[PDB]
Amino acid sequence: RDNIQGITKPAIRRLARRGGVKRISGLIYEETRGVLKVFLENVIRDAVTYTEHAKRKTVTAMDVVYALKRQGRTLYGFGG
Amino acid sequence: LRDNIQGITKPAIRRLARRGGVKRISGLIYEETRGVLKVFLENVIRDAVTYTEHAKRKTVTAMDVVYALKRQGRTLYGFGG
Amino acid sequence: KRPEGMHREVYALLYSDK
Amino acid sequence: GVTIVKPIVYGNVARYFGKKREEDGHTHQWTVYVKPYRNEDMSAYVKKIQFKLHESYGNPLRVVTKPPYEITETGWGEFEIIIKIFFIDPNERPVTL
Amino acid sequence: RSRKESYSVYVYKVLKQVHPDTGISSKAMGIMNSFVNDIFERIAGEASRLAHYNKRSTITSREIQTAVRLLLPGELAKHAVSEGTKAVTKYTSS
Amino acid sequence: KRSRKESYSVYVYKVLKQVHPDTGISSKAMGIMNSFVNDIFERIAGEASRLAHYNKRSTITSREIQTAVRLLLPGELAKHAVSEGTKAVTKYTSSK
Amino acid sequence: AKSRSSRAGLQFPVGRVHRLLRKGNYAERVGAGAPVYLAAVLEYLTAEILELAGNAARDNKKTRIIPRHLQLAIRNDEELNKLLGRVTIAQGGVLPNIQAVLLPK
Amino acid sequence: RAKAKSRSSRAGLQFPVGRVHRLLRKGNYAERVGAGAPVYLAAVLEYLTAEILELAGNAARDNKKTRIIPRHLQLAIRNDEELNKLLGRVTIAQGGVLPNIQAVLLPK
Amino acid sequence: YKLVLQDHQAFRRKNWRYLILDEAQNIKNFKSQRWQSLLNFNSQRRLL
Amino acid sequence: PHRYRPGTVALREIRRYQKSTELLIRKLPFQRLVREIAQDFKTDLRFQSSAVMALQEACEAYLVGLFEDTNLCAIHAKRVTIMPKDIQLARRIRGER
Amino acid sequence: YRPGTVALREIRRYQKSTELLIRKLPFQRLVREIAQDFKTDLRFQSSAVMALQEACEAYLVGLFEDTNLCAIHAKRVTIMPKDIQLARRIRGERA
Amino acid sequence: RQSTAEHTRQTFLRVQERQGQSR
DNA sequence: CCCGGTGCCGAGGCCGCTCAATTGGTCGTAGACAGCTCTAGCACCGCTTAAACGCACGTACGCGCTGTCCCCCGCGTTTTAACCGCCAAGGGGATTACTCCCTAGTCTCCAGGCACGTGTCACATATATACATCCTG
DNA sequence: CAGGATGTATATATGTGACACGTGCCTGGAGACTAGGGAGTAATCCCCTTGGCGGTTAAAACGCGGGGGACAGCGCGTACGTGCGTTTAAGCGGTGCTAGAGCTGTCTACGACCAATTGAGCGGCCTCGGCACCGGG
């Protein structure tokens, strides 16, 4: 599949703008892609671990919130 | 007591930096380190005294310090029995 | 259908986290 | 119509080294201080105390932030020290001694 | 349907008490409910930990007070403690 | 009038001596070891309690503890601990 | 007849808080004043955040608290910031701030 | 009655399953605890302890010491990849640190 | 009709004296979004 | 023709996206990436529409914080521009590495 | 000795031992000072004071380890105040 | 209502009056 | 960026039912409080001296400047797919039936946790030459 | 391209701190054995929320050009390190004293617990108006 390139250069540039950067290097996109991939992999692993125990065929925003709370990135807006 | 933050001298801070890997140290780094250590001790001892007063105790035990460090995120082994 | 056939606790531990 | 009186004592102690020091020529140690006359905590209303020394020192304007306020130093001659006590309330005029 | 439950009504009442005319959207209401639930969880966990430390099998108003002290930063702690103590004193008188 | 305090030093030394016949351990190392045991016990038990509360269950079971271990332990330590726990839960229920 | 919330002078559900405390496995015995105190603290924090977000949304010509202004209030208040430090408000955005080094002139 | 067998011996563990179950049942964790939860918890704890003890003993033999001291614990934890992640936010007294000198601060 | 559906707001914000609809058999369904949008327009006279 | 100098449009984009509150990552590509990642954890797992949105919100917030710290580290080196070493230092100080 | 050799020697020396680097008698007085601001006539255990000193030393060692990289980031060998400031800011203590 | 002490009450009323005057 | 017009779907208010909160009543148990004590925390003072403080000197590192070379930045046009609606059906959840697992209580019993004294059993401190390991020539 | 001149190991030793090992205590645990409770597993089945079809423009992407920013070289200055001498209070451990953490013993108000009653809250539905959208200043 290898659809990690969905997080493209313009999207990473807009994220940088929001983070307050006004100039990006040429090798920042491939590093941001890997960092985001690791962060996802971790959160999704926790979510799937919750879902397996829950015996649900559908991963839920509640499982995502639990994974975020475990990773310490508490998120508000999705019922938790 | 007063001005006991000065009981952390330049040799002590330089040994603490050597143990952290720093090779060359500036002049104001010592004041910065004293100020940071004081701010850290302030919170740690505030949590410890909060755990103590609530227990109606007059002595700050080691478990109070352990719980304060756990709250602050600095879990410390070797003093939990 | 659930294969099971073994002890409840051991069975759950073995399958519920394949 | 409210008048509050706070008793304090300000002074200096000095100890003679017995001989003139060869490093800097100083002959006495001295500690200059403000402390309360009563057994009370000055920090509840004093923000800081500034002590202005003679211009012979590398920095003449010293500062202290906790009671009993004092500075320990060394010297060989007598001079006038200006102690400026600042209160927590910025609207209150600091005292000068 | 089930019965998911939230503090929406009480959040709206406090919103009316603080700003009689300023409303709140559904997303904001949900975020506030999540915040309330998270603060409740944290305070209750800290109170249970204090009870376990003191070997008390009960979580009392004093435990809640100490848990709020151990979590709120300074002026916020001093105000929340006053609010809680006043609420408990007014409750004990009825 | 005795004030006896418990600890895991009697079993931490048994495991130590069975996994290293010739190596000992000092008192300070034993205290740090007991602290580590207590900390990980608290972590795993709290995670199992959280899983139970999320699943709307008032009792913690071996399955909750297993998922809690999978969540807590990282990578190739999670698998080891889980295999050990599974093997122990099967050798315990077999009446041996 | 009388809800404990109104008895204590609070708006939050003292009864629901007591129920959640006794059912959340927090302890085997919930004090009479523990849920009242917890509800009072929760109401205080909620009033603080709601007032700040209200007057942050009304500062932008609006009349309805939104996540953007909730985030603005939470990140401008130094106490609420330390409280919800590692928390992220969905659709909250970030604070307008450009470093002087990046700024021109 | 029949000769009483302990749960730790029945399972094959050394850590106290009885005390683990007592803590679990009287603690904040839940109302009541199943028989399998404390066994699993004690087994996991025993495994972690055996691993860290093996690493500490290896460090001790490397340093030419027969008694595991907090140095051998800190070195083991910060040399192991997974135990380091497990105890990243945990400080050990009198444990010290690693001789990790940055290559940029070396003689040139 | 397609562009009218796409920009009904812009057209709805304009007051029209006459609204002419050629080949009106394209709005024969009252449940049609086309019919709804064309009815929600401000027009003084209508010619099908 | 007319073109702005380097640094004028970047500041406009910053001032715009720092006040605008909307997901910057593309929704369908992010969903496809989430599905790819979940495929390596469990086969044939379904995802609620809100779960992907929550994941995207959390990832965007994390990346925004990471880029803030990266810009801080870059300015620390007297560099107005950021580079992978800045992200490396930011994560190192955060404790993620 | 050349400036830096006796410093790398001390680096290798103090990254080998585990004893406390701060003096007890001076650090206990600082602890009692900071405790005075919270409770008058407060007693402290020797174990509690040792745990406080250990926590402080570990925190300062971590802070200096981060400050070393913050300094090296600017092609500098000496750690300056802005380095510890950036360390604290990115840690979240004075953000 | 009582939300927080001096530095919050007065500053908050000032922020409220700010846009009221600007309007 | 600010201002006047239109517009729509999500905010906010009403209806109604039920299940949780409340009222009343009981048991008991953890706790509040006083009694006693004995450890440890506090204070103090002197002999020893290792560490700290102050100062001199210069060497190497910060830091400021300059120059090249390019690697991003802004703008125009070109190509891909994200996005907004319908249509099956696959699952997430209500509803009912029923059993293995745990709770609770009460004896019976193996096991570990210290008080104490005894016997081994590390490695801290001390000592010295061997080895680097420099740095000035 | 050395060699005084330091500093850093390396190895050996011993005796006092500390693991290590009985000796009996017992009281808090650990398990066995009946009886009772109960919640979640399992099987259906109704019902929304996914995953899957075809267009529309809006954003991603490709290219270009030059411009300002990174990185390297270099030099000036000063301050930070190291060594020496003077100074100070830190470590030691010896003695004296009492304060309160802790064990303990007794008596008791508060809360879990159980049953009945009541209205606060919440799903649901509809009407409506605050702000999304937009085109001219």
Numbering used by the authors:
A (entry chain H): 23 to 102
B (entry chain D): 22 to 102
C (entry chain V): 48 to 65
D (entry chain W): 18 to 114
E (entry chain F): 28 to 121
F (entry chain B): 27 to 122
G (entry chain E): 14 to 118
H (entry chain A): 12 to 119
Task: Paste lines from the article.
As a scaffold, the SRCAP subunit consists of an N-terminal helicase-SANT-associated (HSA) and pre-HSA helices that integrate the ARP module, an ATPase domain grasping the nucleosomal DNA, and an insert threading through the RUVBL1–RUVBL2 hexamer.
Cryo-EM 3D classification showed conformations in the apo (nucleosome-bound and nucleotide-free) and ADP-bound states in the ADP-containing sample and conformations in the apo and ADP-BeFx-bound states in the ADP-BeFx-containing sample, respectively. Cryo-EM 3D classification of two samples (with ADP and ADP-BeFx) showed a shared reconstruction with characteristics of apo state. The open conformation of the ATPase indicates the absence of nucleotide in the active site. The ATPase in the apo form guides the motor module away from NCP, an organization distinct from those in the ADP-BeFx-bound and ADP-bound states. The ATPase is positioned near SHL 2, similar to that in the ADP-BeFx-bound and ADP-bound states, likely guided by the ATPase-associated YL1 and ARP module, together generating multiple contacts with the nucleosome. Despite a slight shift, YL1 and the ARP module maintain comparable nucleosome-binding modes, respectively, in the apo, ADP-bound, and ADP-BeFx-bound states. Despite the use of a high concentration of either ADP or ADP-BeFx nucleotide in the sample along with a crosslinker, the majority of the selected particles in both cases correspond to the apo state of the complex, possibly due to the following reasons. Thus, particles in the apo state may reflect dissociation and/or unsuccessful binding of nucleotides during sample preparation.
